[PDB]
Amino acid sequence: TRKAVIGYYFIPTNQINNYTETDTSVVPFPVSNITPAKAKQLTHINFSFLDINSNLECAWDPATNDAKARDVVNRLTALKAHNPSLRIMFSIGGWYYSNDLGVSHANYVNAVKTPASRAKFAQSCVRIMKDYGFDGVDIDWQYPQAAEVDGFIAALQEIRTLLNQQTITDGRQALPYQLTIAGAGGAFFLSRYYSKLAQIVAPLDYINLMTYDLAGPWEKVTNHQAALFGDAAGPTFYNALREANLGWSWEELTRAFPSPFSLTVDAAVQQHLMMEGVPSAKIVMGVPFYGRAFKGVSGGNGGQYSSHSTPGEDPYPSTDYWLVGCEECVRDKDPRIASYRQLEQMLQGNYGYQRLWNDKTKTPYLYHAQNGLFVTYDDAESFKYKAKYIKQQQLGGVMFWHLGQDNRNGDLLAALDRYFNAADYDDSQLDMGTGLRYTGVGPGNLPIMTAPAYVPGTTYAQGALVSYQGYVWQTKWGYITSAPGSDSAWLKVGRVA
Amino acid sequence: STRKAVIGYYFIPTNQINNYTETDTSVVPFPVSNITPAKAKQLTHINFSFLDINSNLECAWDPATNDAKARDVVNRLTALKAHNPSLRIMFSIGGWYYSNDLGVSHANYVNAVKTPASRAKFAQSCVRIMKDYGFDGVDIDWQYPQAAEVDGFIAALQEIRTLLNQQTITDGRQALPYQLTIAGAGGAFFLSRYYSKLAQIVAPLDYINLMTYDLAGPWEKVTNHQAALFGDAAGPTFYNALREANLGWSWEELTRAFPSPFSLTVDAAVQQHLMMEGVPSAKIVMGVPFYGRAFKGVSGGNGGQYSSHSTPGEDPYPSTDYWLVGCEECVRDKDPRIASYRQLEQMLQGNYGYQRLWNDKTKTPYLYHAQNGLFVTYDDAESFKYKAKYIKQQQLGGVMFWHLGQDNRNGDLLAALDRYFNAADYDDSQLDMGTGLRYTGVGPGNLPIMTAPAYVPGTTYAQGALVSYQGYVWQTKWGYITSAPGSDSAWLKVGRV
């Protein structure tokens, strides 16, 4: 089955309102930059972002010129003429609109509250989808928590019911309307809804993991923002999933959530697979088409794992643009982030950067010795390892943020497509390295084990193993005269064949 | 100034009941007349033991019991009330022999609490037995109900409480109400069976009498004190079974409440009870042993403490070798592994080769026989000074002990307990409680009082920040916290306002 390749197309309201395909100082990335070749390389384009208004319905930002919005969407849906499998999805949410302190956060919480609100919200999503010509709905709430999760789940279920009926009504069985969400790619935010992952994923075609932004100026130590595997020399983090309302014992939590651990792409994927009922085929790995930069770093390890003097707040609080050669940073007023397009140009500009590679994390980084700069980013080489991981782990595919950040020729997208589909690419001998893998085991993903059946009336010593009611259990202490189950003395360690 | 409870077990095997006499210790070692008026005044409760739960699922005497003899023995005990208007003669149902998992009547306990009808019939039989023989309350000693049986056990106790309170009104006993108590586990391993529902178990009781002894024994590989008040870092430590109880707490919560490994001591048991919300200190009674446990084959260097040994742990004693030199009662009872304080005192004053030593951390005595390689852990009037001070400082309900027949002829241990609680001329203000290890877990029931600024919606908090909300003080487990305590898993309750 073809791997999904989901690329975000993000355009701010002011660019839609002044949309033009002949002035990059107004619209840096017009839809006309997406050629038939690029369209064939994508399976989904996530148009972003729509929002939820105070009337608790899906809607465009009110300042949007509707005619111009339709025109932009039309340019994207016209790409389907070049690829019969391509879907132009629309995404509702994003950090700015939906974060806890975001401008529309209350609308997300309130829309999912009751059967009536969820029905009204769900119907609005399908109305918008049909009115503008989209092929599916993507929800990007960053992120629901606590009492909001059950409502969020019911909302997704309702949208799924409505989309499925719309597929039949429209005779779209060959290209059914889809439903996806962008999910947390790190344990801190993931802990908010982790316990109910199976219910969240059930109504979805895919859950697109935001496996990037795992490092940044807001952290005290420089690090790779999207390491595939861990580097013991790099920083480690508290495993927040140990605090999710799971109802597991101390041993169970400890075995499932080693801590401290390496915040990596592999960690997020494995944390999702640890939960029962989350299929690998629905998990999509996200990758960044941009890098993050730090200043005031020390040499020694190429700027890796160093203290730094980079402002961590937003917006960038200063007027000094210190990322040498990054003119894009000047225009966007932030020297802490840059598109791959720009980073690649900086590499061809003889500006003093050295491209280095970490063979444990399988990601590149730039080090500017002279000025004390470190940049963590991804490229066609790190994507070889990530694509092989997607294949080996049987994931659904890849997602990326965002199309406008690829170089002009679209090389990163072309690479992803090549690694999944080209007859002339062979990664059978690609060595995945010895970087740290996430090895937690959840009572939801126990290995097959074999042990003698439990015998009532028997007294068991510490560490004894027995099979009982479908699982293999181990004693945590001695003189056990109780049967396996809720009784504190027994630990579920495997599944009986 | 509420009087501390002093609860002594009066245990009498059936054959002694059937051959009861107060003029021939060869047949009845400890007859009721040995409880002089002076001793009766020092007790608040005598727990007559043991009754059982029969196949009919009702409280009952041992079938081989001569009922007329039993009634006469009981009447002799209730006659003691003539010397102490506060004295209650309770009866205890259970004990290890009848109710342990592999015990002869275990099935009856599990079955008696299964349904509303089985419970009503069982509860009714307890009150009937109480009234018919003239007892003043019901003590249940099931060792011990398991997780699946706990809810039934709780409901049974609530039923008995309801019937007892009705009987108190019907009998005009407002001045000395009928009581309900249980003997509770004094070590974490057995306590973990019902720990999660401690509050519910304790609600219908006047007292929960902790069996804070037998914390060392031949079933353990390392010799140790069986009732250390506080811990000795040089002694063995144990796995904290409570972290595996069915609490539903988070990793941080479980970890801070249940350090592991830990020192199995009397203080640990008491503090573990106080950590639960709804368990009042006034209902907690500290058990103490009037007997010592002996080990053979110990080595030197620590006076016999913390040594490997060659003592059989099975019951009955699997040999005919009575190796506890000087212990005549051990031959009588065919078991050299247990000796009454009465017998130990005689062995000490004899010239048998024992040396009495004192561990100033655990605040308990022990005997070491250098010639034969023997170790004995026991309690005496000196260890009782520290335990009585602890009962007062911690505002516990009182003390319980097993058993009356093991005190010396002058009743010195019972007299000591009464002295430490009630003598106008005893002063323990200067008694040094030592530097032994205290149990430092913190749970919902013993959060320290603290102050912190009120939580403010919309504020972002760093790692370690403290706020007050809903009457508790909370601290963040990581950074960039954007929601409220009780809704965001990043907050840990660490104090009480």
JSON list of C-alpha atoms in Angstrom, two decimals, chain A residues 41 380 384 387 391 410-426:
[
{"chain": "A", "resi": 41, "resn": "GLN", "atom": "CA", "xyz": [4.58, 13.22, -5.47]},
{"chain": "A", "resi": 380, "resn": "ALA", "atom": "CA", "xyz": [17.39, 14.54, 1.90]},
{"chain": "A", "resi": 384, "resn": "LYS", "atom": "CA", "xyz": [16.56, 8.31, 3.91]},
{"chain": "A", "resi": 387, "resn": "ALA", "atom": "CA", "xyz": [11.73, 6.80, 5.18]},
{"chain": "A", "resi": 391, "resn": "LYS", "atom": "CA", "xyz": [8.77, 1.24, 5.96]},
{"chain": "A", "resi": 410, "resn": "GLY", "atom": "CA", "xyz": [11.12, 20.79, -4.55]},
{"chain": "A", "resi": 411, "resn": "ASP", "atom": "CA", "xyz": [13.98, 18.43, -3.74]},
{"chain": "A", "resi": 412, "resn": "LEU", "atom": "CA", "xyz": [12.89, 17.34, -0.24]},
{"chain": "A", "resi": 413, "resn": "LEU", "atom": "CA", "xyz": [9.41, 16.31, -1.48]},
{"chain": "A", "resi": 414, "resn": "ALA", "atom": "CA", "xyz": [11.03, 14.58, -4.49]},
{"chain": "A", "resi": 415, "resn": "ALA", "atom": "CA", "xyz": [13.33, 12.71, -2.09]},
{"chain": "A", "resi": 416, "resn": "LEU", "atom": "CA", "xyz": [10.51, 11.46, 0.09]},
{"chain": "A", "resi": 417, "resn": "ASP", "atom": "CA", "xyz": [8.61, 10.25, -3.00]},
{"chain": "A", "resi": 418, "resn": "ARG", "atom": "CA", "xyz": [11.79, 8.61, -4.32]},
{"chain": "A", "resi": 419, "resn": "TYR", "atom": "CA", "xyz": [12.53, 6.71, -1.11]},
{"chain": "A", "resi": 420, "resn": "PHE", "atom": "CA", "xyz": [9.04, 5.24, -1.04]},
{"chain": "A", "resi": 421, "resn": "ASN", "atom": "CA", "xyz": [8.39, 4.66, -4.72]},
{"chain": "A", "resi": 422, "resn": "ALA", "atom": "CA", "xyz": [11.35, 4.82, -7.09]},
{"chain": "A", "resi": 423, "resn": "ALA", "atom": "CA", "xyz": [12.46, 1.60, -8.75]},
{"chain": "A", "resi": 424, "resn": "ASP", "atom": "CA", "xyz": [15.95, 3.05, -8.88]},
{"chain": "A", "resi": 425, "resn": "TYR", "atom": "CA", "xyz": [16.38, 3.65, -5.19]},
{"chain": "A", "resi": 426, "resn": "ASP", "atom": "CA", "xyz": [17.60, 0.78, -2.98]}
]
